[PDB]
Amino acid sequence: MCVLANATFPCFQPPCVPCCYENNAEATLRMLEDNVDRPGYYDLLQAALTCR
Amino acid sequence: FNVYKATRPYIAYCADCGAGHSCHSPVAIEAVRSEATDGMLKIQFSAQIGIDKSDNHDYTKIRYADGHAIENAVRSSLKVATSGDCFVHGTMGHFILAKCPPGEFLQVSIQDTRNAVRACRIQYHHDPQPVGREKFTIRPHYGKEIPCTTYQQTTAKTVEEIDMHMPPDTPDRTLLSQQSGNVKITVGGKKVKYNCTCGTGNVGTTNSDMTINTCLIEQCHVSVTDHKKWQFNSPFVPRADEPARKGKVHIPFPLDNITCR
Amino acid sequence: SDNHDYTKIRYADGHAIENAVRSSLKVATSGDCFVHGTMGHFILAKCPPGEFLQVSIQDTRNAVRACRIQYHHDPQPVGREKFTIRPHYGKEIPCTTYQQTTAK
Amino acid sequence: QPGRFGDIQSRTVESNDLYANTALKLARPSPGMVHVPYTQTPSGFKYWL
Amino acid sequence: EYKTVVPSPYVKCCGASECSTKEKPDYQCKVYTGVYPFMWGGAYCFCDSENTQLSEAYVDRSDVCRHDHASAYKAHTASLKAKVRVMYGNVNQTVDV
Ligand SMILES: *[C@@H]1O[C@H](CO)[C@@H](O[C@@H]2O[C@H](CO)[C@@H](O)[C@H](O)[C@H]2NC(C)=O)[C@H](O)[C@H]1NC(C)=O
């Protein structure tokens, strides 16, 4: 339920899966930023930074 | 789960950095939180603990920012003192837990990579009255248990959070040099923006070294625009973009109930 | 050698004149103080309130000799509020202090 | 009223509505400085304590 | 207790941002002209005097409000509730009434 551009992707499973931050830092920070008020934000922060 | 990758230490105005001279410090104290009835104080200082410059989570290193690069120092150089040498329990991120003797000011300091001390002092009353009906200094071998509220070590668990945002800019004169009537802007692998009012010079952003011909250093301007990392919302580093684009990060050490002798 | 170097602190022991490390110097009234200007027979310090004043220095034998005098030292900062450390927002009011000029 | 008991006000613990008169008279920044000066009546809850 | 969150001041370089008033408790809004910020390297804004800075602060509930908070109440007529121990002959029992 997190809104990036028009993705409307589910907050569990990132559109950039895996290693979102490693691909494009700026874009990831934007993606997180856009969904600050969404009640599900912390599924996006739980998905976005951490990766193997 | 290193949420600290995004984060970066910041250079924060510090009115009293020792000797009474105001200076721009790596360790500027930005909040003291004293809701713990035990006595522990949560200190908000500008430079994360235990997340090295390479973003590994090792604990012996305290990460801080100088210039624009991120350097690290030894953990064991951390010293907090209100009137006497305080005692630290908790360290993660920007938060340090300290138990301190009563005083009137509050100092935090760490040693630079060049083995020079850098500190910040703030005006904080800190006259802890321990719970109960007797102002005792240390706990006895015999007594009652009353509920005190204090900060634990459990690094995560919701509710309590801070606002991060994009580092605004970082004006520097190091990147500008004068090459025989031209202005040479080095980059050093970081995106750099310039506004030269030398006519043709024009404004713009680059990722690689260049220069502007027939211009003076005293007439141009330059600032490095990082966007990869993230910073604290701190009142002493300006904003970067209208109506605020504010991200969020969980903060360590929530408070909970403990038995207080 | 009467060189003006800063890293060295000169003192007398016996009838000979020896030196020691400059960073040895410690001033303390209640807690550790901070020294600003160290030159000649005179040392400038900003110090927290207390009742005594102790100055300390190591020998060539790395043994601490220090000595203490009784000084009240309850500094009242200028103006109409006693503050411990300077605020980040405030007025400028004229205080008188000692500067590092050796000159004139 | 500011300073006394009730500087902050809230119907329930989890309620969103909130009433505060803490007299936040933010002032002009000192020259040559980024900061945001604010002079504020301290929390009335500590005064009540 | 409250925490007076004050975000980083917007400093509009060579431009004027008039403060847009978002309703939040005790929200205090002002835009100042003539600022000249100085970050560590040097002045963040080239333009000499036409800089402005929009400084804004607002107060919210402290993070411990769930835990340390005084609750104000109104009391009406109360209901007594007792424990009575009663005894006759061989019966000896305590009840809540
Ligand atoms: C680059 O800097 C110049 C000035 O150093 C900015 O241009 C103008 O500066 C004059 C100086 O008096 C002001 O009167 C103008 O108001 C400024 N421009 C505008 C649009 O207000 C210029 O804006 C800077 N570069 C960028 C990209 O803004």
Ligand SMILES: *[C@@H]1O[C@H](CO)[C@@H](O[C@@H]2O[C@H](CO)[C@@H](O)[C@H](O)[C@H]2NC(C)=O)[C@H](O)[C@H]1NC(C)=O
């Ligand atoms: C300490 O413990 C209490 C209960 O063991 C925690 O919960 C609150 O307790 C008070 C006591 O009357 C209740 O009024 C609240 O409704 C309780 N809160 C919840 C969410 O159930 C309390 O949170 C603990 N921590 C503290 C006080 O810091």
Ligand SMILES: *[C@@H]1O[C@H](CO)[C@@H](O[C@@H]2O[C@H](CO)[C@@H](O)[C@H](O)[C@H]2NC(C)=O)[C@H](O)[C@H]1NC(C)=O
């Ligand atoms: C009547 O019943 C109660 C229920 O056990 C007996 O228990 C007494 O409880 C009181 C409570 O304060 C104690 O002080 C007594 O010591 C308890 N009695 C014993 C024997 O331990 C109570 O004693 C009974 N009454 C009689 C007269 O036997």
Ligand SMILES: *[C@@H]1O[C@H](CO)[C@@H](O)[C@H](O)[C@H]1NC(C)=O
């Ligand atoms: C979202 O949808 C609009 C609708 O036309 C489109 O213009 C826009 O490009 C879309 N977003 C992206 C990132 O393409």
